[PDB]
Coordinates of C-alpha atoms in Angstrom, one line a residue:
Chain I
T1412 CA -10.3 -7.8 14.4
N1413 CA -13.8 -8.8 13.3
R1414 CA -12.8 -12.5 12.6
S1415 CA -10.1 -14.9 13.6
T1416 CA -9.3 -16.1 10.0
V1417 CA -6.0 -14.9 8.6
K1418 CA -4.8 -15.4 5.0
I1419 CA -1.1 -16.2 4.5
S1420 CA 0.3 -14.5 1.5
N1421 CA 3.1 -16.7 0.2
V1422 CA 3.8 -20.3 1.1
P1423 CA 6.1 -22.9 -0.6
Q1424 CA 4.4 -25.1 -3.2
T1425 CA 6.1 -28.3 -2.0
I1426 CA 4.6 -28.2 1.6
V1427 CA 1.5 -29.9 2.9
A1428 CA -1.1 -28.7 5.4
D1429 CA 0.4 -30.8 8.2
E1430 CA 3.9 -29.1 7.8
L1431 CA 2.4 -25.6 8.0
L1432 CA 0.3 -26.6 10.9
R1433 CA 3.3 -28.0 12.8
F1434 CA 5.3 -24.8 12.0
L1435 CA 2.5 -22.6 13.3
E1436 CA 2.0 -24.7 16.5
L1437 CA 5.8 -24.6 17.0
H1438 CA 6.0 -20.8 16.7
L1439 CA 2.7 -20.1 18.3
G1440 CA 1.0 -21.9 21.2
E1441 CA 0.2 -25.6 21.1
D1442 CA -3.0 -26.6 19.2
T1443 CA -4.0 -22.9 18.8
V1444 CA -4.8 -23.4 15.1
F1445 CA -8.4 -24.5 14.3
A1446 CA -8.7 -24.6 10.5
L1447 CA -6.0 -24.6 7.9
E1448 CA -6.9 -24.8 4.2
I1449 CA -4.8 -24.5 1.1
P1450 CA -6.7 -24.0 -2.1
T1451 CA -5.9 -26.3 -5.0
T1452 CA -6.3 -25.3 -8.7
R1453 CA -6.6 -29.0 -9.6
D1454 CA -8.6 -31.6 -7.6
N1455 CA -6.1 -32.8 -5.1
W1456 CA -2.6 -32.3 -6.4
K1457 CA -2.0 -28.6 -7.4
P1458 CA -2.1 -26.3 -4.4
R1459 CA -2.0 -22.5 -4.8
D1460 CA 0.6 -20.1 -3.6
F1461 CA -1.5 -18.9 -0.6
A1462 CA -3.4 -20.4 2.3
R1463 CA -6.0 -19.4 4.9
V1464 CA -5.6 -20.3 8.6
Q1465 CA -8.3 -19.8 11.3
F1466 CA -7.1 -19.4 14.9
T1467 CA -9.0 -20.5 18.0
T1468 CA -8.6 -17.1 19.9
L1469 CA -8.2 -13.5 18.8
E1470 CA -5.1 -13.2 21.0
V1471 CA -3.4 -15.9 19.0
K1472 CA -4.3 -14.0 15.8
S1473 CA -2.9 -10.8 17.2
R1474 CA 0.3 -12.5 18.3
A1475 CA 0.7 -14.1 14.8
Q1476 CA 0.1 -10.7 13.2
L1477 CA 2.8 -9.2 15.4
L1478 CA 5.2 -11.9 14.5
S1479 CA 4.5 -11.5 10.8
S1480 CA 5.0 -7.8 11.0
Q1481 CA 8.4 -8.4 12.6
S1482 CA 9.4 -10.9 9.9
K1483 CA 10.0 -13.6 12.6
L1484 CA 8.0 -16.3 10.7
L1485 CA 10.5 -18.1 8.4
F1486 CA 9.2 -21.5 7.1
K1487 CA 11.4 -23.1 4.6
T1488 CA 13.3 -20.0 3.5
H1489 CA 9.9 -18.2 3.0
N1490 CA 8.8 -15.2 5.0
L1491 CA 5.1 -15.7 5.7
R1492 CA 3.0 -12.6 5.4
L1493 CA -0.4 -12.4 7.2
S1494 CA -3.4 -10.5 6.0
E1495 CA -7.1 -10.4 6.8
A1496 CA -9.4 -12.9 5.1
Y1497 CA -12.8 -12.2 3.5
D1498 CA -14.6 -15.1 5.1
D1499 CA -14.0 -17.7 7.8
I1500 CA -13.4 -21.3 6.9
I1501 CA -16.0 -22.4 9.5
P1502 CA -18.7 -20.2 10.9
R1503 CA -17.7 -20.7 14.5
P1504 CA -17.9 -18.0 17.3
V1505 CA -14.6 -17.0 18.9
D1506 CA -16.0 -16.8 22.4
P1507 CA -16.1 -20.2 24.1
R1508 CA -18.9 -19.0 26.4
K1509 CA -21.3 -18.6 23.4
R1510 CA -20.7 -22.2 22.3
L1511 CA -23.3 -24.3 24.1
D1512 CA -23.2 -28.1 23.9
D1513 CA -25.6 -30.7 25.2
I1514 CA -28.6 -28.5 25.9
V1515 CA -32.3 -29.5 25.6
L1516 CA -34.2 -27.8 22.8
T1517 CA -38.0 -27.6 22.7
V1518 CA -40.5 -25.8 20.5
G1519 CA -44.0 -24.6 21.1
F1520 CA -46.3 -21.5 21.5
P1521 CA -48.1 -19.6 24.2
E1522 CA -51.0 -22.1 24.4
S1523 CA -52.7 -20.5 27.4
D1524 CA -53.4 -16.8 28.3
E1525 CA -51.5 -17.3 31.6
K1526 CA -47.8 -18.1 31.9
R1527 CA -48.2 -21.6 30.4
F1528 CA -46.0 -23.0 27.7
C1529 CA -46.8 -26.1 25.6
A1530 CA -44.0 -28.4 24.4
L1531 CA -44.5 -30.0 20.9
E1532 CA -41.2 -31.8 20.4
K1533 CA -38.1 -31.9 22.7
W1534 CA -34.6 -32.4 21.3
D1535 CA -31.7 -33.3 23.7
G1536 CA -28.0 -32.6 23.2
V1537 CA -28.3 -29.9 20.6
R1538 CA -25.5 -27.5 19.7
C1539 CA -26.1 -23.7 19.8
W1540 CA -23.8 -21.1 18.4
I1541 CA -24.4 -17.4 18.7
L1542 CA -22.8 -15.5 15.9
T1543 CA -22.9 -11.8 16.6
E1544 CA -21.1 -10.7 13.4
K1545 CA -23.6 -12.8 11.2
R1546 CA -26.6 -11.6 13.3
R1547 CA -27.9 -15.2 13.4
Chain N
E1349 CA 24.6 -36.3 12.8
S1350 CA 24.3 -34.2 9.7
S1351 CA 28.1 -33.6 9.5
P1352 CA 29.8 -36.2 7.3
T1353 CA 32.9 -36.1 9.5
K1354 CA 33.5 -35.5 13.2
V1355 CA 33.7 -31.7 13.2
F1356 CA 31.2 -30.9 15.9
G1357 CA 30.7 -32.4 19.4
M1358 CA 28.1 -32.3 22.0
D1359 CA 29.2 -31.3 25.5
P1360 CA 27.2 -33.2 28.2
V1361 CA 28.1 -30.9 31.0
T1362 CA 27.0 -27.6 29.3
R1363 CA 24.4 -29.3 27.1
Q1364 CA 25.6 -27.3 24.0
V1365 CA 27.5 -28.1 20.8
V1366 CA 31.2 -27.4 20.6
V1367 CA 33.8 -27.3 17.8
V1368 CA 36.2 -30.3 17.9
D1369 CA 38.9 -31.0 15.3
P1370 CA 38.0 -28.1 13.0
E1371 CA 40.6 -29.2 10.4
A1372 CA 38.5 -32.2 9.2
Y1373 CA 35.5 -30.2 7.8
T1374 CA 36.3 -31.1 4.2
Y1375 CA 34.1 -28.1 3.1
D1376 CA 30.9 -30.2 2.7
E1377 CA 27.9 -27.9 3.1
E1378 CA 25.9 -30.4 5.1
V1379 CA 25.6 -28.7 8.5
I1380 CA 24.7 -25.4 6.8
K1381 CA 22.0 -27.0 4.7
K1382 CA 20.6 -28.8 7.7
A1383 CA 20.5 -25.5 9.7
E1384 CA 18.8 -23.8 6.8
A1385 CA 16.3 -26.6 6.6
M1386 CA 15.6 -26.4 10.3
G1387 CA 14.8 -22.7 9.9
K1388 CA 18.0 -21.2 11.2
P1389 CA 19.9 -19.5 8.3
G1390 CA 22.8 -18.0 10.2
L1391 CA 23.2 -20.6 12.9
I1392 CA 26.7 -21.8 11.6
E1393 CA 28.9 -19.7 9.4
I1394 CA 32.0 -21.5 8.0
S1395 CA 34.4 -19.8 5.6
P1396 CA 37.9 -20.8 4.4
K1397 CA 41.0 -18.9 5.6
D1398 CA 42.9 -17.5 2.7
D1399 CA 46.2 -16.9 4.5
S1400 CA 46.4 -20.2 6.3
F1401 CA 47.2 -23.6 4.9
Chain J
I631 CA 26.9 17.3 -5.1
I632 CA 24.0 15.1 -4.1
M633 CA 21.1 15.4 -6.5
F634 CA 18.4 13.3 -4.8
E635 CA 18.5 12.5 -1.1
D636 CA 15.5 11.0 0.8
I637 CA 14.6 8.5 3.5
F638 CA 12.9 5.3 2.3
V639 CA 11.1 2.5 4.0
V640 CA 10.8 -0.9 2.4
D641 CA 7.2 -2.1 1.7
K642 CA 7.7 -5.6 0.4
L643 CA 10.2 -8.0 -1.2
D644 CA 9.4 -9.8 -4.5
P645 CA 11.3 -13.0 -3.6
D646 CA 10.8 -12.5 0.2
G647 CA 13.2 -15.3 0.9
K648 CA 16.0 -15.4 3.5
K649 CA 18.1 -18.0 1.8
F650 CA 17.0 -17.8 -1.9
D651 CA 20.6 -17.0 -3.0
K652 CA 19.1 -14.6 -5.6
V653 CA 18.9 -10.9 -6.1
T654 CA 15.8 -9.5 -4.3
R655 CA 13.9 -6.5 -5.8
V656 CA 12.9 -4.2 -3.0
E657 CA 9.9 -1.9 -3.0
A658 CA 10.2 1.3 -0.9
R659 CA 8.0 4.3 -0.6
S660 CA 9.5 7.7 0.1
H661 CA 8.5 9.8 3.2
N662 CA 7.4 13.5 2.8
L663 CA 7.8 13.1 -1.0
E664 CA 5.7 10.1 -1.9
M665 CA 8.1 8.4 -4.3
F666 CA 8.0 4.7 -5.2
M667 CA 11.3 2.8 -5.8
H668 CA 12.3 -0.5 -7.3
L669 CA 15.9 -1.7 -6.6
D670 CA 17.7 -5.0 -6.9
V671 CA 19.7 -5.5 -3.7
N672 CA 21.7 -8.6 -2.8
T673 CA 20.1 -9.6 0.5
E674 CA 22.8 -12.1 1.5
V675 CA 25.6 -9.5 1.3
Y676 CA 23.4 -6.5 2.4
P677 CA 20.5 -7.7 4.5
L678 CA 17.3 -5.7 4.3
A679 CA 14.1 -6.6 6.1
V680 CA 10.5 -5.3 5.6
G681 CA 9.9 -2.2 7.8
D682 CA 13.5 -1.0 7.9
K683 CA 14.4 2.6 7.1
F684 CA 17.4 3.6 5.0
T685 CA 18.7 6.8 3.4
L686 CA 19.3 7.0 -0.4
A687 CA 21.5 9.4 -2.3
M688 CA 22.4 9.9 -6.0
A689 CA 25.5 11.9 -7.0
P690 CA 27.1 12.2 -10.5
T691 CA 30.6 11.9 -8.8
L692 CA 31.9 10.8 -5.5
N693 CA 34.5 13.6 -5.4
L694 CA 34.0 16.9 -3.6
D695 CA 33.3 20.0 -5.7
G696 CA 34.0 18.6 -9.2
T697 CA 36.2 15.9 -10.7
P698 CA 33.4 14.0 -12.4
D699 CA 34.1 10.4 -13.5
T700 CA 35.0 11.3 -0.8
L701 CA 31.5 10.2 0.1
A702 CA 32.5 6.5 0.4
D703 CA 33.0 6.6 4.2
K704 CA 29.5 8.1 4.9
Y705 CA 27.5 5.4 3.0
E706 CA 27.9 1.6 2.7
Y707 CA 26.1 0.4 -0.5
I708 CA 27.7 2.5 -3.2
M709 CA 26.8 1.5 -6.8
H710 CA 27.6 2.9 -10.3
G711 CA 25.2 2.9 -13.2
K712 CA 23.6 4.9 -16.0
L713 CA 20.2 6.3 -16.8
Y714 CA 18.9 5.0 -20.1
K715 CA 15.1 5.8 -20.0
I716 CA 13.4 8.9 -18.7
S717 CA 9.9 8.2 -20.1
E718 CA 7.1 8.4 -17.5
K719 CA 4.6 11.3 -12.4
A720 CA 7.9 11.0 -14.2
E721 CA 10.1 7.9 -13.5
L722 CA 13.7 7.0 -14.0
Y723 CA 15.3 3.7 -15.2
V724 CA 18.9 3.3 -14.1
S725 CA 20.8 0.0 -14.5
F726 CA 23.7 -0.8 -12.2
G727 CA 25.5 -3.4 -14.2
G728 CA 22.3 -5.2 -15.1
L729 CA 20.5 -4.4 -11.8
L730 CA 17.5 -2.3 -12.7
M731 CA 16.3 0.6 -10.6
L732 CA 12.9 2.2 -11.1
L733 CA 12.4 5.5 -9.2
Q734 CA 8.8 6.8 -9.7
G735 CA 7.9 10.1 -8.1
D736 CA 6.7 13.5 -9.2
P737 CA 7.8 15.6 -12.3
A738 CA 9.1 18.4 -10.1
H739 CA 11.0 16.2 -7.7
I740 CA 13.2 14.6 -10.4
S741 CA 14.0 17.1 -13.1
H742 CA 17.8 17.6 -13.1
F743 CA 18.6 14.2 -14.6
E744 CA 20.0 14.0 -18.1
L745 CA 19.8 11.1 -20.6
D746 CA 22.7 8.6 -20.8
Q747 CA 24.6 10.0 -17.8
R748 CA 26.6 8.2 -15.2
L749 CA 25.2 8.4 -11.7
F750 CA 26.0 6.7 -8.4
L751 CA 23.7 5.2 -5.8
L752 CA 24.5 5.9 -2.1
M753 CA 22.5 3.9 0.5
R754 CA 22.8 3.6 4.3
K755 CA 20.4 1.8 6.6
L756 CA 20.7 4.5 9.3

């Protein structure tokens, strides 16, 4: 429950990322999958037997886990088994409120003894993500 | 469309498939393979009748 | 007449395929006895899904009070095989016509099994 990334145990070797994404979006909600990655032993033509999928919301992850526990995920005569992943594909917070877009960023120091702040350089339209788990 | 011969029909009023002319199946496992590919293993079950000819 | 009787819950399936058209080896862990079992079950004829609970029994004969070599009505997955290897937490290796069974438990739980004996396999999914 710490992170939204889920590792799929067994997937067919003949499939591509697009097919698995379409299957997940058909069984789960529409565009509820953020990152899907299938490791390849070779450079670009020998995928492995497992894959890691990152969901947008924790509720989608819980629903996918419930479906996997009931063996209701059958993709090309293969029963997908879902397990927790060691690390996320992308360090992105689950909560949409934490994600801040198009905010002005400035730096400085308390130049004066009174409540006066000096601005050295101001950056506009920066992206701020608050990762509670990573403490950064 | 997967069936090689006209063994299944689509009913417009009920919006569901129906079995029409079941004697022209020719025992080609095309509809079963299509159902398995679509993700439904036990959608259509067809077996020969041993005591009927 | 029943030597070993217990309730098992399947943990995982080695093929884990609905339409593989192949024998699927099931892994089940016993309850209240902590015994691990390997069994080759034809999923297409006898469907088994992960998380299901089934009872398992082993008897030298299916007759009542003797006549070795009428429990058929009670169960639904009767098999016949022989035990060929008892080497071990002792474990048993019984082959049902080429279908291997590996019952791994405790030395005290399984002790009345002789070498090269014919035994049955009764299984019902509740």
